[PDB]
Design a binder for these strands. Structure first.
Ligand SMILES: [Zn+2]
Ligand SMILES: [Zn+2]
Ligand SMILES: [Zn+2]
Ligand SMILES: [Zn+2]
Lengths: 287, 46, 143, 55, 56
RNA sequence: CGGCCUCCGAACGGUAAGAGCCUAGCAUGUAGAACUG
């Protein structure tokens, strides 16, 4: 390798990062074979991390060789794949998996080291679903240590040097507790991923009306910095518009459309996020 | 040392019959008897 | 029963007043040596030994240099008989290294990046006061 | 390093006298006339054998 | 430079480990094993410095 | 004046092969860990 592949969270904060290398250090639980191991000092009194997957095992799905989440968005791989509608055929059984890994490394040897191989580019339409489920700031709780089992029973007699966060241990009844690393990599029943599914299912999106002839769309929360041509340029080449009523006595709008699916495109993509000159409009189908 | 495994043609000893006959390079012997370590171990555990 | 004496030559004549201190330090080195690792083994297993060693050789460091209560030739005998630590002492004699805990705490090769233990950095530069445990000695900011 | 010693002749003569037992009371090599490495090499090559020598 | 140690250091480690049965050490297991390739060096070294009977 | 003095012992080939079965060990010591108008 040249260096690891991991997100900013796993990657660190200080401008000068310190990581030690060992060639052929241990076994990628994916490629199953020896890899290089680079070990990075995450943060002040924060657990030193290490590279935990073959670089090819990484370029396969385009995820973090330490943080394990995708490198573009940073959600569970099950999620990110489905958010691209992506459907990978990676084999599972022992002999099948070894044959797959061998030919995979052969096929990746013909690469230039810039981007993951295969459908990872022909699924690069990062949907606003993924964009919105994407975390914003570095959830740097990751580099805090374990539960110092001594310090959970009382025993951690080393003073403050408990090797692990001497807090209350999580009740493993939580589905967010035991996610086998191999399953999390295979996209195999990640309960955290199902939580992201429930969250991105309950997260607000624009609603559909009943009758097809309701082609009037009310956009609530306009303000008096908007123009009718600006409401147009928001919803104009996204189809054809038939008319628009910019209600200044109520600070809203209403686009009567010329294509129903065009209306759907503009409005559903616009739900609360059509931010032209900074005003939170609400795209709905009018009365 | 203690020369540990005596040479007890086990086909003979258990079934009274060795297929090799005269050439069996072991000892034709059907005698059950406490060994060179059985007794040591039982007594010390006693 | 003591560290049986090899040279066969008679110890010079300040030995008799460090006598019981040396004897006792040896006895408790023996006891802290045979001491069982009930959570005091592993990383902290030798935490006690260097303690006793540095202890003894500091004692002799005083009693020859800071008091001059002892003869040169006696103290020579008492290094050559393995109580003291001639190299630890020849460093202790330095300007910033008065309390260097274990002579391995400045071994630059003993560490991957080519430094010393944080056991050597003076605490004022740290400003974080987080308890510092140099793994080797366990020591607490020798400097 | 413990190399390259120099010694006094008193020392040497005393030592000599002390190691007198494990030593050869020979003064020269006209003893080993037909009994030296080269004689043995010739013998070995000719398959002959000196009375008291190897074969 | 690399510098010497008190003998009691090693003595403590070694009487500590004893015969590697205690689940405490459990990794020096495999390092101990791997050290076998050099056991014929240790023996030659030990035996060529033996104490020459006039010294005790 | 004659001298002439080999050697040396162990292993395999010999007391089946098996699937199941069950439980120590032996290995692991990791990775992660949740959010709004
Ligand atoms: Zn028989
Ligand atoms: Zn230190
Ligand atoms: Zn130290
Ligand atoms: Zn120190």
């Amino acid at each position: 390798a040249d260096f690891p592949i991991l997100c900013q969270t796993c990657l660190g904060e200080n401008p000068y990062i310190r990581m030690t290398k060992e060639k052929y250090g241990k076994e990628c639980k994916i490629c199953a074979r020896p890899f290089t191991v680079f070990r990075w000092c995450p943060g002040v009194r924060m657990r030193f991390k290490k590279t935990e997957v073959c670089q090819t095992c990484s370029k396969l799905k385009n995820v973090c060789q330490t943080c394990l989440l995708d490198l573009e968005y940073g959600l569970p791989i099950q999620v990110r794949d489905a958010g691209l509608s992506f459907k990978d055929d990676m084999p599972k059984s022992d002999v099948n998996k070894e044959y797959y890994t061998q030919n995979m490394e052969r096929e990746i040897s013909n690469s230039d080291g810039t981007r993951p191989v295969g459908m990872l580019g022909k699924a690069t339409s990062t949907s606003d679903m993924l964009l919105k489920l994407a975390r914003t700031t570095p959830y740097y709780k990751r580099n805090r240590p374990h539960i110092c089992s001594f310090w959970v029973k009382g025993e951690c007699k080393r003073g403050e040097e408990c090797p692990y966060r001497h807090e209350k241990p999580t009740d493993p009844d939580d589905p967010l507790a035991d996610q086998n690393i191999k399953d999390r990599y295979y996209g195999i029943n990640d309960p955290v991923a199902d939580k992201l599914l429930k969250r991105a299912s309950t997260m607000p999106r624009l609603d559909p009306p009943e009758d097809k002839t309701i082609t009037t769309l009310y956009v609530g929360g306009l303000g008096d910095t908007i123009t009718e041509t600006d409401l147009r340029n928001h919803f104009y080449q996204f189809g054809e518009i038939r008319t628009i009523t910019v209600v200044q006595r109520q600070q809203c709008a209403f686009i009567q459309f010329a294509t129903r699916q065009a209306a759907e495109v503009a409005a559903e993509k616009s739900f609360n996020k059509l931010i032209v000159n900074g005003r939170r409009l609400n795209v709905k189908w009018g009365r | 040392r203690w020369d540990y495994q005596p040479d007890i043609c086990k086909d003979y000893k258990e079934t009274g019959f060795c297929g090799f006959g005269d050439s069996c390079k072991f000892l034709h012997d059907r005698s059950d008897y406490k060994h060179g370590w059985q007794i040591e171990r039982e007594l010390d555990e006693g | 029963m003591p560290k049986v004496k090899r040279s066969r030559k008679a110890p010079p004549d300040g030995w008799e007043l460090i006598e019981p201190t040396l004897d006792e330090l040896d006895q408790k080195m023996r006891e802290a040596e045979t001491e069982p690792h009930e959570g005091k083994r592993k990383v902290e297993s030798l935490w006690p030994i260097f303690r006793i060693h540095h202890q003894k050789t500091r004692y002799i460091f005083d009693l020859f240099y800071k008091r001059k209560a002892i003869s040169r030739e006696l103290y020579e005998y008492c290094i050559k008989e393995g109580y003291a630590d001639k190299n630890l002492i020849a460093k202790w004699k330095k300007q910033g290294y008065e309390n260097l805990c274990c002579l391995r705490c400045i071994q630059t090769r003993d560490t991957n990046f080519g430094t010393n233990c944080i056991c050597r950095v003076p605490k004022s530069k740290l400003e974080v006061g987080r308890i510092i445990e140099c793994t080797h000695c366990g020591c607490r900011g020798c400097s | 390093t413990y190399q390259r010693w120099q010694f006094t002749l008193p020392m040497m003569s005393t030592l000599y006298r002390l190691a007198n037992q494990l030593l050869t009371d020979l003064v020269d090599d006209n003893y080993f006339y037909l009994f030296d490495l080269k004689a043995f090499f010739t013998s070995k090559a000719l398959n002959m054998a000196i009375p008291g020598g190897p074969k | 430079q690399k510098e010497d140690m008190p003998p009691e250091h090693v003595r403590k480690i070694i009487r500590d480990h004893g015969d590697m049965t205690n689940r405490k050490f459990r990794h020096d297991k495999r390092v101990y094993l791997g050290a076998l390739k050099y056991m014929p060096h240790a023996v030659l070294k030990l035996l060529e410095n033996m104490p020459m009977p006039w010294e005790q």
